Amino acid sequence: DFTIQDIRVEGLQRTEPSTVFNYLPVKVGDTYNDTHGSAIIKSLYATGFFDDVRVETADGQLLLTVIERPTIGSLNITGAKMLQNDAIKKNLESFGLAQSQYFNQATLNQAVAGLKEEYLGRGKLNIQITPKVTKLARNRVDIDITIDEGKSAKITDIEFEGNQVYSDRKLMRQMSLTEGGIWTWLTRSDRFDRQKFAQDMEKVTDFYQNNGYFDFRILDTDIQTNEDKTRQTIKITVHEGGRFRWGKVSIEGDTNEVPKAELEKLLTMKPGKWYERQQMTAVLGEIQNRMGSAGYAYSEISVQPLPNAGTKTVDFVLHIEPGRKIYVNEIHITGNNKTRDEVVRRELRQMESAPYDTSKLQRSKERVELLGYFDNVQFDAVPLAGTPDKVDLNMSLTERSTGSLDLSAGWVQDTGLVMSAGVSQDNLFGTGKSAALRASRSKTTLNGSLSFTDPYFTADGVSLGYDIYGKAFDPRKASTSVKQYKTTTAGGGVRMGIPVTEYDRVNFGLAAEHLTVNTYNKAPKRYADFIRKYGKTDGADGSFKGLLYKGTVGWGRNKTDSASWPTRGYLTGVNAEIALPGSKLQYYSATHNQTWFFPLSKTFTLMLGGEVGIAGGYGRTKEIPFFENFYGGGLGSVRGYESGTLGPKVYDEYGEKISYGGNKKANVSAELLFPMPGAKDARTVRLSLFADAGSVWDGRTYTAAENGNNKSVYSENAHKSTFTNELRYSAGGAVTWLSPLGPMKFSYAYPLKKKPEDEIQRFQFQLGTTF
């Protein structure tokens, strides 16, 4: 045996032998023959230290020759043709390859193998993969991969066996892959991927499963190449089950508190259609979420078929095991930075020690997502050593940028430019306390506003807020001018808001405003009567002022995915936001909406629009203000002619034609919405048509005008522009897109029944939304 005395480790380059001895499992004065040799050699082989180190026994000064492992100080990349330099850079550095980092050849080999496999996974097989190694300075080395990809990998022929049940034409129509063609030249739609192949495989197999053929035994698939390994052909053979009939699926097991009668009620299976695979999946989902809605996350169902040919039925007995009633031990919260913790706790149920149900858990999911403060949230269940009845349910948060400035511009067809300003803020770096500034300005209007609110004034939570406004309207503009005047509206208000259930939530608000209505030189009788009834005139002009005690009552709910891509669901709601009694002008006006969406196809869909309301008031004032009139005809009305162009076009000074409209709101939308599939699934392009129904009435017939009748018949009733339930026939196209930089308006309008008293507009364009 020999004792260590200041091992003279030589042959080192930059190993700082002090830290070597520190890394040595032994120090001076340690007895050693062979025990630590393998340990030290493997320790230095780890961390990429060396490759050849020798140890001997010689008078305490053991010559530990060491050869420094190469360290890639500088790394380089090339050959990135299909992918960019950044992509290859990150996916390589994900496997080491940092500065120096003690480069090893085996790391090179595994990395190149992995990347090669990644590329061959896609439609690239005839690929030249030739990395090059250049010896840089003493330890630094350089590598650069060279990738020379093939032409492409195209699928020429698609063929099958056992196709006696359905025509290969229809089935190939069903399967979501392409072959050679002219309209398929776009976006290289005939390329191949293993993953997408498998996806289409399960898709078509499930399609057959719904077609009544049991278990659809897939025999085998094979892919065969061609000359130059360029073109490929796919052939899969399967075995169908034949037609059948299912009408007697049964369930069994224990229920504990659960009622078996409720189980029978929820069992939605019938002999009709003889089967449905996804219906079976859905009923499994329903039963499972029920089995755990009571607090059993680990109750498990067992399926088993019981065949019977001839009658061609296979019974399904569903055996359930419930057990181990589960509660929650503690809740942890992640992604809590820049915000409070109770704020997200405000909403979910199951405070603690509660029967773990997904039923209210998905409700919590929905409740937090509609907050929109985070793009992604995940709910994570984990038990501990004290396993029974107690599991952690920590959840995820994804903090998203929200504190910025709302400086956004847009363009409108009539007025022109419009700008928006104000800091966007909803969270004073913590709890909600949502308060912000919002203002807009155009050549015809301006409106500043500050908002301030807490969504939860109470334990359940009541939203209380202040909100100011200063909107002023300047209808007088260039040639395309509606009746010229100004509007002066400003002031503040308080908004209160309470939910009545998980899906219903109302909000009220009372305030008081003031307006100074003003006129111009001689205006039609609808102005003279109004001003001489309440206002005061001076010369050829005049004005009026009044108090604006206003009340507001509202309610709503959403049910569609939307997010600029509408899906199943619709908007429900009602509102009443005008100067309510308590001051002059005793008025009342309703509100409605319907946004029915029918996603019954891959791209084509239709939306039904819904609105009902009467703006008529009561009390001392039996009339309707001109400025409170509807702007019938145009975009927001019908998307048809130019804005605010329904009703009697009255003659006046200079003999122009400006209408009024009524105080009746009712609309019916029906448009075939769909994207463009040429480019990709990007959430960027739509397309539809324009076909709307809009009704608006006043009741009063108009017969006397400025020495001229603008109607075909002298006795033209002005209560409705046409027969009862008034509307004009019109329908055109609508090029939709989604976002060049966001907002848009584009559509082609074609009218019908062109009257001699109405004006049309075939195309309209707006930018940066409005308001």
Binding site: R14, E16, S18, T19, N22, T47, G73, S74, A98, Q99, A137, R138, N139, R140, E330, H332, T334, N336, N337, K338, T339, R340, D341, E342, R345, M351, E352, S353, G403, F429, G430, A459
Partner: protein, 233 residues
């Protein structure tokens, strides 16, 4: 490596210094590796990595900072500079967030994460157990006491908000863990007070009185002996 000019070590150090003074970083960081390759047997790697970590703290990310620092920890675990490293570790997980838009003189720090202050506590514990006579430890002690105070305030706020919802059952275990593992903290009186409120709301006279004896033995003087607890604000 735009120029790869040959210079002396102190010139590069001063250039890095002014780059920090001028908030210039890419050249400052990129000259570090070239100087190290040119000057392998040099102490400048340690200052380079620590200043890069400081800059990354001044930036959003810290991953490459930690990569380099535990890389060094594997390199020379005897260069006494590691005291700063773990310290800046506690700093990088502290996230002081020096920005004008979010001054918030209050800044309770009670929102970062449990992971950050757990790691801070363990890091400074290793610091003190290995360097009781460190270049500085009072800041470390202040950091641990502040973080544990923030933890206790967090949990107490959770309990009181539960009380806003009257989640008596949850608050029970809340209090039990507060007294169990969060000793000598200012947030104890209200904990046991709300505990008493829970038991009396849950009709548990004997245990409520037992806790009364506990508190009076511990806190004979407190306004809430005669004051039934109420939530602040």
């Amino acid at each position: 490596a735009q120029i790869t000019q040959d210079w002396s070590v102190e010139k590069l150090y001063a250039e890095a210094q002014d780059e920090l003074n001028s908030s210039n970083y890419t050249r400052a960081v990129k000259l570090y590796e070239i100087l190290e390759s040119r000057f392998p047997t040099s102490r400048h790697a340690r200052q380079s990595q620590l200043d890069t970590a400081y800059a990354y703290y001044k930036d959003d990310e810290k991953d490459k900072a930690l990569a380099a620092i535990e890389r060094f920890r594997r390199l020379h675990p005897q260069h006494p500079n590691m005291d700063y490293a773990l310290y800046l570790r506690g700093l990088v997980l502290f996230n002081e967030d020096q920005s004008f838009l979010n001054k918030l003189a209050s800044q309770d720090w009670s929102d970062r994460d449990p992971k950050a202050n757990r790691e801070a506590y363990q890091a400074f514990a290793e610091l003190v157990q290995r360097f009781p006579n460190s270049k500085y430890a009072a800041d470390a002690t202040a950091r641990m006491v502040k973080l544990v105070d923030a933890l206790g305030g967090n949990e107490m706020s959770v309990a009181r908000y539960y009380m806003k919802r009257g989640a008596y059952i949850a608050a029970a275990n809340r209090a039990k863990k507060i007294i169990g593992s969060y000793q000598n903290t200012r947030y104890v009186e209200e904990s046991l007070a709300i505990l008493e409120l829970a038991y009396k709301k849950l009709d548990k006279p004997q245990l409520a009185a037992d806790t009364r004896r506990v508190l009076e033995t511990n806190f004979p003087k407190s306004p809430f002996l005669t004051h039934a607890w109420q939530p602040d604000d």
